Design a protein around this ligand. Structure first.
Ligand SMILES: C[C@H](Cn1cnc2c(N)ncnc21)OCP(=O)(O)N[C@@H](CCC(=O)O)C(=O)O
Ligand SMILES: [Mn+2]
Ligand SMILES: [Mn+2]
Lengths: 555, 411
DNA sequence: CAGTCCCTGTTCGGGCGCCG
DNA sequence: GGTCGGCGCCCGAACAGGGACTG
C-alpha cells in the first residue's frame, strides 16, 4: 500500500476497551450491487484492502442514494466503534452565513469528489475499521475489507478531515493572501478582487495544488457563473436568497410533521421577516408520541396561513460592506415573540431572525427586549465580528428609568429610539417614599402545610379590615393574595406593608406578564392605580398592624 | 537545555474541555499576529483534533495600554491542578504587603516563556482560535513553554524568580515583593518619588535576566464601609419600620442589636407618613445600637484553608458596595466604590471594574482570589464582560438574583 | 435544631431544520 | 436509509438551590 501524501492523525481507543464485533445486518440486493461495485473500485485505488481471518473486528455497512445523482454513498454504522474511540475536539465552530460575505470581483465554487476517501487513516488504527460485504448468496462467505482512509460514519472523520483540509490550504493561502477561501468541509468558496483573467489562473493553481495531495476537483461540480449554489443559498452578484423551501401540507398532521414544519420555519426566518412559530410549537408541548395525529388549533391554523403568505413573496438578502455601519431593528410581534432585521441600507436586509424564549415565571417587555438585544449581539459577532447599532421601540426615558432603578446590572449597547408601535414601556411605577394622605394597608397571609387551608387579609389605619378563607393554597399564594386584596379595596393611592420577601421581590421587578393567574390579577390592579408604595417589615416582631393581621390569618 | 519539572493533574480528574466563545474582529486579528509570532519563536505549536482538551482564549488591553495582550481562561485547568501550586511548590504570602504605603504591580508574564513545559502536560494547554463567519475551521495550538495565566507557571518559575530578586532584596531589605500569577507586587514605605525610582531599578534588574507596565496602589488608604443608621430629628412610622428591619438584619452580624423598645413604637396600626416621637427607652436603644455598629464583630479572622467569597450590591447612582467573607455574616472586609469608569451609563463596565478592584485587594491582603456572587443575569454578563476586562487573571463567579431587602450596606 | 416543600431557575436529553 | 460532525429552534424531565415552617 502506497503512502498517502497527507500526514496521518494518530488515533487511539479509550483505555481498556477493544474494537467492535457486530454482525452484518441483511441488505437488499440492489444495495449489495452498489457496494461491491464501489468496494472493488476503492480497493483498486488503495482506499481499502482485504483482510484475512486474523482480523477479529467487524462493523455493519450500508449505503444511501445521492441527491440528484445516480451514484451511491457508502456509510458505516460505527455506533459501537465511536463509543470506544477516543474523544475528539471538533474544529468546526459554526456554519458560515452569506450575510457575512463581502463583495468580490470574481467568485468560484468547487467541490471535492469523495472527500473522506482521499485522506489517510492511522495505520495502527485501520484494524478496527473492518466491515463485511455480503454477497448475492447467503452461503457465500463474503469479502472483508478494512479502511485505509477516513470512513463515513466514524465520529473522528469530520474533525480529522477539516483539520487535514486546513493544513493543505495553508501554503496556498500564505502565498495568496488576497484570496478568500471559505472552507466548509470540502466545499470551497473562492473569491477575489483580482481581475477575471488572473482569477481563473489562481483557480487552476488551486486545483493543481489540491491535486498534489489526492484531492480531485471535478469540472462537473465546478461553478464559474452566477447564481452560485453555496451552503443551500443562491449567491448573485448583488443579492442572495435561500434555496426554495417547501412546507409540507397535510390534511392529517402528526407530531413529527410539526417538528418538520417548525424546523423549516426557523430556517426560513433567517431572511423572511415576520415568521411566527409560537402557536405551532404549542402543539409539541405535553405530547410524547411522534406518530400521534394532532389537530391544528384555530391559532395554529392562522399562524400557519400567515407564514405561507410570507413565503409566497420572494425575499433576498444583501452582502456585507465593512465601510458602513451595522444596524439591527427589533419589533414586538406577539406576546413573548420578537423579530429583528440586520441591515446596512434601509430595506436591504443582510438577514432577519426572531426571538421568543420565555425566561422565568414573571417577566416584562423590557427584560425580553434586553434578552433579544443580547442574542442579536452574539449572533452579529459570530457573523461580522462586531456589535451592530440598535434601533429599539423603547423610549430613552423608559429605558433610563428601568436600568437605573433595577437591582441587577443591566445594559444595552449604543442604540436609538425608533417610534414603531407597539412601544415597550413600563406599566406601573412603585413609589420610593410613602404617600401622604393614602390609606396604609397592613397585609398578611398564612396557610397550613397539611390541611392546605389558609387565610388572607389586611388591616388599615382607618379601621378597615378583611379576612378571606382560602382552600388548597400555600403560604406564598396567601401572602400574594393579601396584597391583591389591599389593591382591590383601596383608592387610586395606597400604602401597603407586608412581610413577604417572596411577594415583594416579584412585584418590585415590575412584571407585566406572569404564568400565575394571581400575579396577572395583581398586575392588572397595579396598572389601575396612580401611586403604589410597597414596604417590607420583619415578621413576628410586633410591628404595626402586621402583628394584629398575622394573628388573624394564623389559622 | 533546561530540565522540565514534571506536573500531573489531580488524581481522578481529566483535562479541561471548554468550548471557545465568539470573538470580535479586533480580538481575532490581535490573536493571529500574536500566535503567529509565538509560533515562530517556538512558544506554541499547532495541533489537531486528536487533542480532546481545549481552553478559551481572548485578548485584552490593560489600563492606558495600546498593545493587545493574549489572555487564556485557564480557570478550569487551574482547578484541576490545585494540589500542585499549594502542596509542593507553594508561594508564601507576606502579611506586611497590605501595610505598605505604596504597592506597584508589574507584568512579568513574558518571563514564563523562557522555561519549557513538561511534554506530558502540554496536551492540557490546548486552545482554539475562531474565525469570523466561520470562514475556516478552528486553528488549534498548544503551549511548549510555561503559559501566561496558569497557576503552575509562577510555581515552577519561583525558584528562578528568587535568584533574580536576591541581589535586589539584599540591597533593599525593607521592600516587600509578592508574586501572583503573571503579576509582581512591589511594596515599600518610601516616598512616592524614590519609590518609582526603586521600581525602575527593578525593571532594569529584570531586563538583564531577559518586565514593563506599572499600576500603583495604596493599601493604607483602603477604607471599609460600616453599617450606618440615619440621624434624624423627626421620625415617621415608615422611617422607624425601615430602621427596625435594618437593625433586625444587622442583628445577624451583631448579636447585641435590640429592637424591642423600637418595636413598641410600632404597636398601633398607624399611617406610614405619621410622625412618631421616640420614647426615652427607644432613644437609648438606638444610641446603643449605633455604638455596637462601631465595635468589630466578635470572632472574625481569616482562615487560610477556606475560600474567599465576595458579594456585590448595586446601590444606584454609580454606588457599589461589597463584602468579603469565608463564613456567612463573618465579613473579613466591607467596602464601597463610586464614580468608576462607565458610571451613570454602563452597569457592566462598573461591575467589571468593581470585580477587578475587589480581586486586587484580595491578592494584596490574603494572596487569594475570591469567588464572586454577581448581581447580574448570566446571559447579560457572558455577553459583555470581556469587552471591559483589563486584568491578566480571572476570578471565579456565580450569578445571584437577590431583590433588595432593607438596604443594609448603603444609607 | 435538621427535615421538608413551595417556588424558581438551570442544565441536559432528544426531535426537527440546515450544511458537508 | 435509520452513519458522523457542526450550528440553530422547541419541549419536558431531571437537577439545583434558596425562604418558610415544623419535629
Ligand atoms: C463525506 C463528506 C461529508 N458528508 C456528507 N454527507 C455525509 C454523511 N451522510 N455522513 C458522513 N459524512 C458526510 O461529504 C462530502 P463528498 O463525500 O465529497 N460528497 C457528498 C455528496 C452530497 C450529496 O450529493 O448528497 C457525500 O458523498 O457525502
Ligand atoms: Mn465533495
Ligand atoms: Mn405571614
Amino acid at each position: 500500500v502506497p503512502i498517502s501524501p497527507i500526514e496521518t492523525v494518530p488515533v487511539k481507543l479509550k483505555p481498556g476497551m477493544d474494537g467492535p464485533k457486530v454482525k452484518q445486518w441483511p441488505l437488499t440486493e440492489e444495495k449489495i450491487k452498489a457496494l461491491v461495485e464501489i468496494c472493488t473500485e476503492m480497493e483498486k485505488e488503495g482506499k481499502i484492502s482485504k483482510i484475512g481471518p486474523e482480523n477479529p473486528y467487524n462493523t455493519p455497512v450500508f449505503a444511501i442514494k445521492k441527491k440528484d445523482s445516480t451514484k451511491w454513498r457508502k456509510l458505516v454504522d460505527f455506533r459501537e466503534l465511536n463509543k470506544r474511540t477516543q474523544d475528539f475536539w471538533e474544529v468546526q465552530l459554526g456554519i458560515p452565513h452569506p450575510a457575512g460575505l463581502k463583495k468580490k470581483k470574481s467568485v468560484t465554487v468547487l467541490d471535492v469528489g469523495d472527500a473522506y476517501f482521499s485522506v489517510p487513516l492511522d495505520e495502527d488504527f485501520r484494524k478496527y475499521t473492518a466491515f463485511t460485504i455480503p454477497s448475492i448468496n447467503n452461503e457465500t462467505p463474503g469479502i472483508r475489507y478494512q479502511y485505509n482512509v477516513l470512513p463515513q460514519g466514524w465520529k473522528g472523520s469530520p474533525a480529522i478531515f477539516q483539520s487535514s483540509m486546513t493544513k493543505i490550504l495553508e501554503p496556498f493561502k500564505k502565498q495568496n493572501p488576497d484570496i478568500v477561501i471559505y472552507q466548509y468541509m470540502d466545499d470551497l468558496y473562492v473569491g477575489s478582487d483580482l481581475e477575471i483573467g488572473q482569477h481563473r489562473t489562481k483557480i487552476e493553481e488551486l486545483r493543481q495544488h489540491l491535486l498534489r495531495w489526492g484531492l480531485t476537483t471535478p469540472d462537473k461540480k465546478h461553478q464559474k457563473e452566477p447564481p452560485f449554489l453555496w451552503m443551500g443559498y443562491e449567491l448573485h452578484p448583488d443579492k442572495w436568497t435561500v434555496q426554495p423551501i417547501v412546507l409540507p401540507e397535510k390534511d392529517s398532521w402528526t407530531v413529527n410533521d410539526i417538528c418538520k414544519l417548525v424546523g423549516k420555519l426557523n430556517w426560513a426566518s433567517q431572511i423572511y421577516p415576520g415568521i411566527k412559530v409560537r402557536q405551532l410549537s404549542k402543539l409539541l408541548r405535553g405530547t410524547k408520541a411522534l406518530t400521534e395525529v394532532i389537530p391544528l388549533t384555530e391559532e395554529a391554523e392562522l399562524e400557519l396561513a400567515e407564514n405561507r403568505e410570507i413565503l409566497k413573496e420572494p425575499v433576498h438578502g444583501v452582502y456585507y460592506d465593512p465601510s458602513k455601519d451595522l444596524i439591527a431593528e427589533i419589533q414586538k410581534q406577539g406576546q413573548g415573540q420578537w423579530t429583528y432585521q440586520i441591515y446596512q441600507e434601509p430595506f436591504k436586509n443582510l438577514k432577519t431572525g426572531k426571538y421568543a424564549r420565555m425566561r422565568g415565571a414573571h417577566t416584562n417587555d423590557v427584560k425580553q427586549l434586553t434578552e433579544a438585544v443580547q442574542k442579536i449581539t452574539t449572533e452579529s459577532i459570530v457573523i461580522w465580528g462586531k456589535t451592530p447599532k440598535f434601533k429599539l421601540p423603547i423610549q430613552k426615558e423608559t429605558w433610563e428609568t428601568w436600568w437605573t432603578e433595577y437591582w441587577q446590572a443591566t445594559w444595552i449597547p449604543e442604540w436609538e429610539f425608533v417610534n414603531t408601535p407597539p412601544l415597550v414601556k413600563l406599566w406601573y411605577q412603585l413609589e420610593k417614599e410613602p404617600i401622604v394622605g393614602a390609606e396604609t394597608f397592613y397585609v398578611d397571609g398564612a396557610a397550613n402545610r397539611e390541611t392546605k387551608l389558609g387565610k388572607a387579609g389586611y388591616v388599615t389605619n382607618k379601621g378597615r379590615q378583611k379576612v378571606v378563607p382560602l382552600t388548597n393554597t400555600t403560604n406564598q399564594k396567601t401572602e400574594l393574595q393579601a396584597i391583591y386584596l389591599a389593591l382591590q379595596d383601596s383608592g387610586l393611592e395606597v400604602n401597603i406593608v407586608t412581610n413577604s420577601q417572596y411577594a415583594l421581590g416579584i412585584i418590585q421587578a415590575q412584571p407585566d406578564k406572569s404564568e400565575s393567574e394571581l400575579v396577572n390579577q395583581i398586575i392588572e390592579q397595579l396598572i389601575k392605580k396612580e401611586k403604589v408604595y410597597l414596604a417590607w417589615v420583619p415578621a413576628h416582631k410586633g410591628i404595626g398592624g402586621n402583628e394584629q393581621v398575622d394573628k388573624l390569618v394564623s389559622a | 537545555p533546561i530540565e522540565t519539572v514534571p506536573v500531573k493533574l489531580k488524581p481522578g480528574m481529566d483535562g479541561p474541555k471548554v468550548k471557545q466563545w465568539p470573538l470580535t474582529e479586533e480580538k481575532i486579528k490581535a490573536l493571529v499576529e500574536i500566535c503567529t509570532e509565538m509560533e515562530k519563536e517556538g512558544k506554541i505549536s499547532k495541533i489537531g483534533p486528536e487533542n480532546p482538551y481545549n481552553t478559551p482564549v481572548f485578548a485584552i488591553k490593560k489600563k492606558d495600554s495600546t498593545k493587545w495582550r493574549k489572555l487564556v481562561d485557564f480557570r478550569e485547568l487551574n482547578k484541576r491542578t490545585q494540589d500542585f501550586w499549594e502542596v509542593q511548590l507553594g508561594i508564601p504570602h507576606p502579611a506586611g504587603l497590605k501595610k505598605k504605603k505604596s504597592v506597584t504591580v508589574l507584568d512579568v508574564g513574558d518571563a514564563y516563556f523562557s522555561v519549557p513545559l513538561d511534554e506530558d502536560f502540554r496536551k492540557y494547554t490546548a486552545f482554539t482560535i475562531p474565525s469570523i463567519n466561520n470562514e475556516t475551521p478552528g486553528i488549534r495550538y498548544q503551549y511548549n513553554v510555561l503559559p501566561q495565566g496558569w497557576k503552575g507557571s509562577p510555581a515552577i518559575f519561583q525558584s528562578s524568580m528568587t535568584k533574580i530578586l536576591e541581589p535586589f532584596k539584599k540591597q533593599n531589605p525593607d521592600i516587600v515583593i509578592y508574586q501572583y500569577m503573571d503579576d509582581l507586587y512591589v511594596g515599600s514605605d518610601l516616598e512616592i518619588g524614590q519609590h518609582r525610582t526603586k521600581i525602575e531599578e527593578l525593571r532594569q534588574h529584570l531586563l538583564r535576566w531577559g518586565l514593563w507596565m506599572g499600576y500603583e496602589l495604596h493599601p493604607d488608604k483602603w477604607t471599609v464601609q460600616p453599617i450606618v443608621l440615619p440621624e434624624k430629628d423627626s421620625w415617621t412610622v415608615n422611617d422607624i419600620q425601615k430602621l427596625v428591619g435594618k437593625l433586625n438584619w444587622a442583628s445577624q452580624i451583631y448579636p447585641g442589636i435590640k429592637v424591642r423598645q423600637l418595636s413598641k413604637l410600632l404597636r398601633g396600626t398607624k399611617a406610614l407618613t405619621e410622625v412618631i416621637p421616640l420614647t426615652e427607652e427607644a432613644e437609648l436603644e438606638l444610641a446603643e445600637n449605633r455604638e455596637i455598629l462601631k465595635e468589630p464583630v466578635h470572632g472574625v479572622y481569616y482562615d487560610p484553608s477556606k475560600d474567599l467569597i465576595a458579594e456585590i450590591q448595586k446601590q444606584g447612582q454609580g454606588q457599589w458596595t461589597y463584602q468579603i467573607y469565608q463564613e456567612p455574616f463573618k465579613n473579613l472586609k466591607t467596602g464601597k466604590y463610586a464614580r468608576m469608569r462607565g458610571a451613570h451609563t454602563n452597569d457592566v463596565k462598573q461591575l467589571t471594574e468593581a470585580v477587578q478592584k475587589i480581586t486586587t485587594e484580595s491578592i494584596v491582603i490574603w494572596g487569594k482570589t475570591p469567588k464572586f456572587k454577581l448581581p447580574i443575569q448570566k446571559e447579560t454578563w457572558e455577553t459583555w464582560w470581556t469587552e471591559y476586562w483589563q486584568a491578566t487573571w480571572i476570578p471565579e463567579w456565580e450569578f445571584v438574583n437577590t431583590p433588595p431587602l432593607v438596604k443594609l450596606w448603603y444609607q
